[PDB]
Amino acid sequence: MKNVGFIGWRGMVGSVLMQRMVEERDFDAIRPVFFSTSQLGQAAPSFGGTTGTLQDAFDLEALKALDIIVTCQGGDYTNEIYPKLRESGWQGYWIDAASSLRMKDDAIIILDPVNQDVITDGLNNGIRTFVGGNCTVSLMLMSLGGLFANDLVDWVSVATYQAASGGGARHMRELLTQMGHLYGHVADELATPSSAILDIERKVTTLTRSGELPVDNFGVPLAGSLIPWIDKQLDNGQSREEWKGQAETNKILNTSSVIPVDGLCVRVGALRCHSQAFTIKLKKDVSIPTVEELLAAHNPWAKVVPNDREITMRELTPAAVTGTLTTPVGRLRKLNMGPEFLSAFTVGDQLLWGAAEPLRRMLRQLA
Amino acid sequence: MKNVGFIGWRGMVGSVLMQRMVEERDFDAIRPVFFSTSQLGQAAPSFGGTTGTLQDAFDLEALKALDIIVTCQGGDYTNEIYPKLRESGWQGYWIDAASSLRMKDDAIIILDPVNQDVITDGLNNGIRTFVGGNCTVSLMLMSLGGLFANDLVDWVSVATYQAASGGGARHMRELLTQMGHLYGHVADELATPSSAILDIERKVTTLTRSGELPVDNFGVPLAGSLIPWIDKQLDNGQSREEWKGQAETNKILNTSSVIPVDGLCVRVGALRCHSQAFTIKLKKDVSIPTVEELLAAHNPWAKVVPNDREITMRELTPAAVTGTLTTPVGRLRKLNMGPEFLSAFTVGDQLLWGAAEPLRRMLRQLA
Ligand SMILES: NC(=O)C1=CN([C@@H]2O[C@H](COP(=O)(O)OP(=O)(O)OC[C@H]3O[C@@H](n4cnc5c(N)ncnc54)[C@H](OP(=O)(O)O)[C@@H]3O)[C@@H](O)[C@H]2O)C=CC1
């Protein structure tokens, strides 16, 4: 029985991760310890049928006692404790969800179904830090894994439809709240099916334009609009969120040569799943049936959806994926630009495969 | 004082078109009329000093009396009355917003700022039908007009973030309603900002997945998700909404050679504005400053937004455009694939430039 510490288990990711471990009875093989950063000393989760109290997430000594650490707290926490802990001589395993140590030397980005070999290699090479990549990239590779795995990709152009859950709980709750505010302001006009549309329109356009909407976690309203910028601003024209695309994809895949990945990461009113619209350029003119066969033959979760108007609406949508381990790919076909241009549209819960699952699976490897 | 008849002025478009005509004092140079297909007999608009009662938009004899007809009703009406009317020998002008006659020989797709010449030529050639193009395309050309106007485009790849207002009033009201249902179900949990996020999450995911959400106008929930298919299914892998991209763009621009336009049209929780993420391939390596200078030098509404994280959030969003005649373009820069790949992201009210305005401006031309 290994002493596994859990930090940031209360957050959006931690919660999904906890819920998942119970399902697969993940707590049966380990010795759970629950840390906190604001409720230190309080009653502990007891997920693994364990009775205790919340440990000091910042107690170095307390942290050095565990064989493994699983954090879903955030990058701010990592950058604060990790360097200080490794310095203390801690030679345990650090499984993280935050981006912090992703592009670091002593860390390996994990996506079992996509790069187990890399994982294993680094494992036999001394790597003790395993980090999950960006939920979107992690999702992209899970859905379009077959293509890369066959060296069929020349470069990729993405346009993401990212859900509010990506920013965390406060962000989701904010969207939902903003949602309510919007509706309420016109609940009566909506009650009267004939009432002029402009009346309802003006009313909602005004609310939004009025600082009345809670935008503390988004800076701007998202309920009835979108935001073309996710992460910080980089020294280039790229936004950190977009830049993660190319960097991490090559790291995860351990490519011999950079596979150009770029596009636009946009935040939308999507509640829980992350969807992406691709414009991939193939090295050779591969037939779509071959492509589909490949994508499906890469991993049990990569599910190809037919280019059907009905099916697409019923399956290639957050509402039909949110909560599932499936990572659908649809709207697959060649673009008018030529047969080397493949058009695809994926969707997937970024809290599972894009977050919790990779870690959960990795933890079981070291348990 | 021409006899201009107005049909379908009640809907999401007619309303906008009407509200605009008042603002610009458009009614002053014309003797209006107001028909209807669902409230014949009731009260008339009372816009341009002409109050009375809705007339029969199905009375051919009555229609033949007008010098011009402006419909915002819909394709079903057009397909029904237009052929029958032109047969009766009606030689008047027909300004439409409906797709029906767009790709027809006797019609011209209007976008004054983008193709005045074509409009004019067609006017001098005998064309009496002027139709506005798909909101999306119409918006793209208004925003990216400078590029095409300079033969700098090789082909375009779009991924649209289309608003609920595109489907009409019932569609918007539905989204808004769906919105309220979502929030309400978790109004209490949201009231307690410290409560567990999964509880709230589970609660909203259940509602959606349950047929309790009003999805009459969309077939599936949109409030907290999206739909990767807009129009009907074409005999190819393209969805009618996407297919409109290439066809109309070349018609409007009156291109000598087809400019490949393709991508994915998705419907989102956006309330009123249509945003688009492009991946355009230039014929030559044009510097971004040149591009920006061009885009801005094409038309007074094409506004280039700097690649600033702050500015972008504050301006390149539906909330900051909805209700304005401006068609912003931001996130402009070269993609990693090479200097010939320009990345752009536009936003614009599809009910103004995407709908009413083109007609409004055209009518005045014929007044
Ligand atoms: N959100 C997503 O979809 C994904 C996020 N990530 C990454 O994972 C890390 C954590 O992400 P995420 O789960 O979104 O973070 P959250 O902000 O939702 O959770 C992190 C911490 O926030 C605190 N918190 C404060 N208020 C609440 C509240 N009302 N409900 C729940 N928790 C609250 C908790 O601190 P305390 O210790 O006191 O309990 C918790 O551990 C980040 O580095 C992020 O970038 C990676 C993939 C996906």
Ligand SMILES: NC(=O)C1=CN([C@@H]2O[C@H](COP(=O)(O)OP(=O)(O)OC[C@H]3O[C@@H](n4cnc5c(N)ncnc54)[C@H](OP(=O)(O)O)[C@@H]3O)[C@@H](O)[C@H]2O)C=CC1
């Ligand atoms: N929506 C958009 O942003 C754009 C739409 N178009 C095109 O314009 C055409 C019409 O679309 P649009 O105006 O959006 O459609 P709407 O359904 O919003 O309005 C058009 C007609 O719908 C009827 N209607 C039924 N119920 C309502 C209601 N509750 N509130 C208001 N009107 C109602 C009205 O008929 P009646 O008067 O008889 O009651 C009205 O004339 C289409 O062919 C479309 O493709 C083009 C560009 C943009």
